[PDB]
Amino acid sequence: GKCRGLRTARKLRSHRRDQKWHDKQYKKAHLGTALKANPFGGASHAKGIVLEKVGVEAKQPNSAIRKCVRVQLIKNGKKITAFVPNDGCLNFIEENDEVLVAGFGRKGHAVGDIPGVRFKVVKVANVSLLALYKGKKERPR
Amino acid sequence: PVARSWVCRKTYVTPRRPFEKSRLDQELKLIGEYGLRNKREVWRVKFTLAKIRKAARELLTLDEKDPRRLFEGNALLRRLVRIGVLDEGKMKLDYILGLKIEDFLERRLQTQVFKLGLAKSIHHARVLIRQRHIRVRKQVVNIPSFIVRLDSQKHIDFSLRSPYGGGRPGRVKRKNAKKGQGGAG
Amino acid sequence: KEWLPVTKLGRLVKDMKIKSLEEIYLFSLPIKESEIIDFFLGASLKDEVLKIMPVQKQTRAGQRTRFKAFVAIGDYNGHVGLGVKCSKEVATAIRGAIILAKLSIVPVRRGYWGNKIGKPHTVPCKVTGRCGSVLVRLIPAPRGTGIVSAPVPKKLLMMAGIDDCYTSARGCTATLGNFAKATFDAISKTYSYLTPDLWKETVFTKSPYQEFTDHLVKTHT
Amino acid sequence: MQNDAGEFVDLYVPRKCSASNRIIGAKDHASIQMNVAEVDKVTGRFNGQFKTYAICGAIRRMGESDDSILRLAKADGIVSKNF
RNA sequence: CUUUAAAUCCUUUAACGAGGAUCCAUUGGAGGGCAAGUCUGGUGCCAGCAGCCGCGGUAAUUCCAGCUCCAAUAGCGUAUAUUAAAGUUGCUGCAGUUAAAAAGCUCGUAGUUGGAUCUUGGGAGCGGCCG
């Protein structure tokens, strides 16, 4: 510290206060703009409906195309591009079904070689995608 | 408005570094030589030893001739004597920190019935503890994680309802006897 | 095969005239023969390899790479060591590293925490070491608490013979050479500290040169 | 260091500078165990006893070693007070 | 039998209740952090994996399967809010020449901080100067 007196507390209050608001993580976690911009509204998971399936390309150092699902939410009703994770799973999700959209890991950031997509799919039609992948449970048609 | 307990504490802790070599190898070594089951046993013993060491450090950081310090020091010293880890010859507050985890593991009932000679092997010892066979002061015990006090040592023997302790024959022996009497009859 | 001296130091430790190395650290006298350590420190001296990091140049034709072998050394009751060697391939780099680690050896003094009972187990004071941006601290610790540090100073402290310490680091810790040199400088400054124990004005013992010059004036000229 | 048993746990006693009262370490090579000879009392000869001195590296590093050897020789009595 | 308002739960105890104990232990992994295959087959920048770096272009120690293996084990993995690690909000305990950072300069009211100095010493004794 700099102000090293005894009868001073208010300047140290206001300075630590203002330099704490000058941070970016504290300004993200304590303003309503970051919570308003997030489509989940503070939720961890959220359910939505499939309306169109659009694939997106990769980034520069690795060349592929990654298959994704575009989902309109139920609680909010905003267009959010999710991403079906596993191999050979776009044939399991079709038009107009119930999905469970979740985060992918970097606290609402675009992750890796997928541009502009930050959300994934963990459950479809109230059955888990891992059991559909491993073949222990069958999708109810 | 209910009359319940709501009291619980975790007896184990997990180390900060999950993957490395030396501590994993020595915990595996201790599990091998003392016939334990998993890592939660040694984590529990390390946690209670750390709590004892923290209490000893909190006692040592205060000055001499304080009678709260004298009371908890004498009580903790008498407790570690009564468990049987510390000796009566060296009964001072600074000898708490000169202890290892194997001294706490040595007062296990599994290791005690293994070293007493009634159990042939340490795996056989843990099995026989679980098997409803022993009795300590005429009371049977299922539980290998039993901290044996020093004075309750000579009163360990098989139960009276045990086939090795004299009494009814076993279920497999009576089944084979029934089969033999049916075949020879 | 059989070792022949270069200085008179090898001569005096060869003809059974120097009792220990402790008088050599007493007279602050440099040792530049690594096999004197082989003679006086026996099988308790053990070896380990810290990090093999390659470095490379830049010319017209490719990048000429060379290995940098980091090796510390030290017997588990007393002395330590550290060696930095950079040769062409890895085996000669390792051998030069263990030779230079046997060369640069400082002793350590072991102290106590608060109460004064028994054999020593701890650094006697808050010492520190700095090189580059690494600040390694050694805080005295109660008995049986174990080493609380990063893995490689934990290794250096267990081959130092010091069982219980607390540390505090600062800076770019990811550079292993600077971090290891900083904790070596911290552990070398143990004697380089004035304490009330050292207040007895010692007498000056006669030098081994001054009492063995009657042999080294006639053996080698 | 002393102990409760009365046994010194010291492994080697380090020497001390006679000028600035500091300690010469194990890997300091700028230190000299200086020996000074005294004259025989009657005419001019050499007895055999020694008047030893020591100095650390920092005093020679800043360069005040001649001053220190004069003060030590004057304190032991080799150099007269008038000087 | 016991328990209890009467039961269920627990303890005790007759008759039963095992050998490939099928009376079958899973969950995430094996390039670095990060403990653990340059094993064998298939597509060979497609499929995909990957929290970060990156791995896939025809001998993939990172993909998809078999065997082997390692971590915890009735438990294990993912997402989000938070804490230690953060000496990257620093009162203990940060930085301001060149990496982020001293207002163009001076005065100035609130606020913080503020030079020295006012009372010493002894006695009887516990004993061979002092606790």
Domain ranges of chain B: 18-180
What φ, ψ does residue C111 adopt, rounded to 5°? Answer: -115, -150
- Specify the residue for token string 């222990």: A136
d(CA B69, CA B61): 10
C36, C103 Cβ separation under 8 angstroms: no
Q: DSSP string covering B29-59, please?
A: HHHHHHT--SHHHHHHHHHHHHHHHHHHHHH
d(CA B140, CA B145): 14
d(CA D54, CA A88): 83
The number of CA neighbours under 13 Å toward the Cβ of A136 is 6
Neighbours of chain D (3+ CB pairs under 8 A): C
- Report CA Rg, chain B: 22
Region of D2 please: left (phi>0), alpha (psi -120 to 50) or beta: beta
Domain C8-106 has CATH 3.30.160.20: yes
What φ, ψ does residue C167 adopt, rounded to 5°? Answer: -120, 165
Q: Structural domain of residue D77, as residue ranges? A: 1-82
d(CA B131, CA A123): 46
d(CA B104, CA B122): 17
Paired tokens of A22: 């000058």
Q: C66: helix, coil or strand?
A: strand
d(CA A35, CA A41): 6
What resolution, expressed in A, was reported for this entry?
4.2
- How far the first Cα of chain B sits from its last, in Å, is 69
- Report CA Rg, chain C: 20
Residue C23 with chain D: CB contacts under 8 Å:
12
Residue at C113: amino acid letter = W
- Of C116, C78, C74, C118, nearest to C98 (Cα)? C74
d(CA A130, CA C161): 53
- Specify the residue for token string 């120097």: C18
**Is B98's CB within 8 Å of C143's CB?**
yes
What φ, ψ does residue B161 adopt, rounded to 5°? Answer: -95, 25
- Specify the residue for token string 């050694």: C138
Q: What sign results for the dihedral spanned by CA atoms C179, C181, C187, C189?
A: negative
- Of A110, A58, A106, A61, nearest to A81 (Cα)? A110
**CA–C1' distance B73–E112 (Å)?**
49
CA A40 remoteness from chain centre:
8
CA dihedral B6, B11, B15, B19 (to 10 degrees): -100
Paired tokens of B154: 């000579």
List C-alpha distances in Å: C106 to C21, C31, C102, D22, D73.
11, 11, 10, 18, 33
C143 to chain B, closest Cα gap in Å? 6
- Of B119, B123, B141, nearest to B132 (Cα)? B141
The experimental technique behind this entry is cryo-EM
C84, C101 Cβ separation under 8 angstroms: no
What φ, ψ does residue B125 adopt, rounded to 5°? Answer: -65, -50
Q: E strands along chain C, which residues?
A: 45-47, 51-56, 65-75, 81-87, 127-131, 134-140, 147-148, 165-168
CA C94 remoteness from chain centre:
17
d(CA C179, CA A97): 57
Q: B108: helix, coil or strand?
A: strand
d(CA C208, CA C34): 19
Q: D23: helix, coil or strand?
A: strand
Q: B181: helix, coil or strand?
A: helix
Residue C151 with chain B: CB contacts under 8 Å:
20
Strand order in the sheet with C127-131: C127-131, C134-140, C165-168, C147-148
- Specify the residue for token string 């908890």: B72
For chain B residues 64-83, those near strand E by a CB cutoff of 7 A are: none
List C-alpha distances in Å: C52 to A83, C89, C183, C187.
42, 11, 19, 23
Q: E strands along chain B, which residues?
A: 134-136, 156-158
- Of C144, C137, A110, C79, nearest to B60 (Cα)? C144
d(CA C83, CA D47): 47
d(CA B91, CA C87): 58
B135, B157 Cβ separation under 8 angstroms: yes
C179, C156 Cβ separation under 8 angstroms: no
CB nearest to B98's CB, from C114, C144, C151: C144
Residues 6+ apart with CB under 8 A from B43: B12, B13, B14
- How far the first Cα of chain D sits from its last, in Å, is 42
C77 to chain B, closest Cα gap in Å? 19
The domain total for chain A is 1
d(CA C115, CA B98): 13
Residues 6+ apart with CB under 8 A from B99: B49, B85, B86, C144
Residue C115 with chain B: CB contacts under 8 Å:
60, 94
**Is C143's CB within 8 Å of B20's CB?**
no
The number of CA neighbours under 13 Å toward the Cβ of A79 is 6
d(CA D5, CA B88): 21
Answer yes or no: is A33 CB < 7 A from strand E: no
Determine the residue of chain B that is closest to C116 in CA distance. B94
Q: What sign results for the dihedral spanned by CA atoms B62, B66, B68, B74?
A: positive
Environment class of residue B117 by beta-carbon count within 10 Å: exposed (0-12), middle (13-18) or buried (19+)? exposed
d(CA C52, CA C84): 11
Q: E strands along chain A, which residues?
A: 45-52, 56-57, 65-66, 70-73, 79-81, 98-103, 119-124, 127-128
C198, D23 Cβ separation under 8 angstroms: yes
B113 to chain C, closest Cα gap in Å? 29
- Specify the residue for token string 């990811």: C174
Q: E strands along C10-159, which residues?
A: 45-47, 51-56, 65-75, 81-87, 127-131, 134-140, 147-148
Provide the residue count of chain A: 141
d(CA C66, CA C87): 6
Residues 6+ apart with CB under 8 A from A92: A124, A129, A132, A139
Long-range contact list for D67-73, CB < 8 A, 24+ apart? D68/D18, D68/D19, D68/D20, D69/D34, D71/D19, D72/D18, D72/D19, D73/D36
d(CA C184, CA C84): 12
d(CA A99, CA A81): 12
d(CA D7, CA B11): 43
Paired tokens of D1: 């260091």
Q: DSSP string covering C178-203, please?
A: HHHHHHHHHHHTTSSS--GGGGS---
d(CA B168, CA B160): 9
D23, D29 Cβ separation under 8 angstroms: no
Q: How many CB atoms lie within 10 A of CB C192?
A: 16
- Tell how strand C165-168 and strand C147-148 pair up: parallel
d(CA B26, CA A14): 53
Q: What sign results for the dihedral spanned by CA atoms B64, B66, B70, B72?
A: negative
List C-alpha distances in Å: D76 to B10, D21, D42, D80.
72, 17, 19, 10
Q: C11: helix, coil or strand?
A: helix
The domain total for chain D is 1
Residues on chain C bordering chain D, Cβ-to-Cβ distance under 8 angstroms: 22-23, 25-28, 30, 78, 104, 106-107, 109, 111-112, 116-117, 119-120, 188, 191-194, 197-198, 201-202, 204, 206-207, 210
Q: C122: helix, coil or strand?
A: strand
d(CA C148, CA C129): 17
Paired tokens of A117: 């997509």
Residue D54 with chain C: CB contacts under 8 Å:
204
List C-alpha distances in Å: D5 to A33, A54, B56, C124, D12.
71, 83, 24, 19, 19
Neighbours of chain A (3+ CB pairs under 8 A): none
CA D14 remoteness from chain centre:
13
Q: Which nucleotide is nearest to A113 (CA to C1')?
A: E50
Cα angle at A49 between A43 and A50, to 5 degrees? 125
- Tell how strand A56-57 and strand A65-66 pair up: antiparallel
d(CA B106, CA B101): 9
List C-alpha distances in Å: B54 to B78, B87, B142, C112.
17, 21, 32, 18
- Of D51, D54, D43, D48, nearest to D15 (Cα)? D54
d(CA C136, CA C140): 13
- Of C50, C48, C91, nearest to C67 (Cα)? C91
CA D80 remoteness from chain centre:
19
Q: At what angle do helices B67-83 and B39-60 cross, to 10 degrees?
A: 150
Q: C140: helix, coil or strand?
A: strand
Environment class of residue C212 by beta-carbon count within 10 Å: exposed (0-12), middle (13-18) or buried (19+)? middle
Q: Of all helices (H) and strands (E), which one includes residue D53?
A: strand D46-55
User: Which residues, listed in sequence order, are joined to residue C137 by a DSSP beta bridge?
Assistant: C128, C168
d(CA B37, CA D73): 75
d(CA B13, CA B46): 9
Q: B146: helix, coil or strand?
A: coil
Provide the residue count of chain D: 83
C57, C44 Cβ separation under 8 angstroms: no
d(CA B7, CA C148): 32
Residues 6+ apart with CB under 8 A from A129: A85, A86, A89, A92, A121, A122, A123
d(CA C13, CA A95): 89
Environment class of residue A6 by beta-carbon count within 10 Å: exposed (0-12), middle (13-18) or buried (19+)? exposed
Residue at A131: amino acid letter = A
Environment class of residue C91 by beta-carbon count within 10 Å: exposed (0-12), middle (13-18) or buried (19+)? exposed
Residue at A87: amino acid letter = D
CATH number for the domain that contains residue D25: 3.30.1230.20
